[PDB]
Every structure is written in structure tokens, then in C-alpha cells.
Amino acid sequence: TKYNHDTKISSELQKKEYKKEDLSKINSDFKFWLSVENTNINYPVVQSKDNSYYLDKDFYKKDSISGTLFMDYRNKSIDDKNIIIYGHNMKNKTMFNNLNKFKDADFFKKNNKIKITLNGKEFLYDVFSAYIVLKTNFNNESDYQNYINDITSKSLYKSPIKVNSNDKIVTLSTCRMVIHGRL
Numbered sequence: 001t002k003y004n005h006d007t008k009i010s011s012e013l014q015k016k017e018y019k020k021e022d023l024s025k026i027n028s029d030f031k032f033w034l035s036v037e038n039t040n041i042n043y044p045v046v047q048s049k050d051n052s053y054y055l056d057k058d059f060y061k062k063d064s065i066s067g068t069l070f071m072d073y074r075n076k077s078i079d080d081k082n083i084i085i086y087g088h089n090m091k092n093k094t095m096f097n098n099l100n101k102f103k104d105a106d107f108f109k110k111n112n113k114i115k116i117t118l119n120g121k122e123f124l125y126d127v128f129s130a131y132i133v134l135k136t137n138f139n140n141e142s143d144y145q146n147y148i149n150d151i152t153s154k155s156l157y158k159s160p161i162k163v164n165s166n167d168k169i170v171t172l173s174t175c176r177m178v179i180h181g182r183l
Contacts, residue, residue, distance in 0.1 A: 125181025
């Protein structure tokens with residue numbers, strides 16, 4: 001078990017989160033907290049003006065090979081139809097490494113929910129597709145519904161959770177393992 005600077009910072013932020021401190025004041029790019037059931041994915045999510053900045057920058061905007069979990073710069077509101085979050089596949093089993101657990105059929109069968117926590121509100125998304133291999137914007141419902149069909153059938157396993165254009169979707173992607181939730 002490796003204790004290094006990255007693992008320390010992230011466990012401290014988890015604690016500030018539990019002590020309900022305002023993390024915006026540490027980094028104005030903070031958007032919400034993210035956790036995934038039955039994993040150690042339990043991190044802060046930030047947003048830059050691009051999809052690159054926080055690849056190599058910790059929550060304090062110092063260098064880090066762990067980066068910070070960040071949301072696609074195109075995302076606007078919690079009501080976006082696909083909220084996309086990116087994070088790394090770290091070797092010490094941190095960040096988005098545990099997305100791999102969704103490779104396990106039985107694990108997948110279970111209902112592990114993705115939990116966005118924002119402004120004292122909890123948004124639960126039920127995972128319904130996972131696989132190894134990205135749109136935030138849809139011009140209308142047709143494109144959307146096609147996106148849903150597209151990613152539903154890319155799933156390694158058929159989900160008992162069914163999904164359509166009246167649901168909102170979250171997408172946890174590594175930067176290649178990928179999973180989609182539905183609200």
C-alpha cells in the first residue's frame with residue numbers, strides 16, 4: 001500500500017467534504033462531489049475552460065499525475081442530457097481505476113449508483129452500461145435517443161435498467177474504461 005502526496009490530498013478533501021466545508025473557496029472550478037457505490041470513487045469534480053487542464057493538476061492546481069476529476073467543458077447545467085466526467089486509471093487503484101470493477105458481470109448486475117452531490121442535493125444515476133473502447137450536446141430528441149441506443153448496445157452486459165430520452169445520463173470515462181448512469 002502506497003501513501004504518497006496524491007493519496008494524502010484526496011483523503012483530506014474527502015474529509016473536508018464530510019465536514020461540509022465549502023470547497024469552491026479552495027478552487028473556484030469546483031462543481032460538485034462525485035462518488036460511486038461499492039467503490040472508492042469519492043472525489044471532487046472540477047471544470048476548466050478545456051478538457052485538458054486538470055489531467056495533470058491536483059485540486060490545488062499544483063502538478064499531479066493523478067490530476068483531478070473534471071467535467072467536460074461543454075457541460076452547462078445539472079440538466080444537461082449527458083454529463084461527462086473524466087479521470088485517470090491510476091496504478092495504485094485510485095481516481096477512476098475502480099471503473100474496471102464494472103468489468104465484472106456480477107458486480108455490474110448489482111445496482112451500483114453514481115452519486116453527484118451538489119448544493120446539499122443528492123442526484124442518483126443508476127448504472128446501465130459499462131464497456132471499454134462522448135457527446136454532451138444533442139440538437140434534438142432523435143440524436144439523443146440514438147445516442148442512448150448507441151451506448152446501450154455497446155454495453156458488455158445487458159442491464160435490467162432500461163433507458164430512454166426522458167432520462168438524464170451521466171458518463172464516467174477514463175483518460176480506456178467507460179460507464180453510463182441514468183436518472
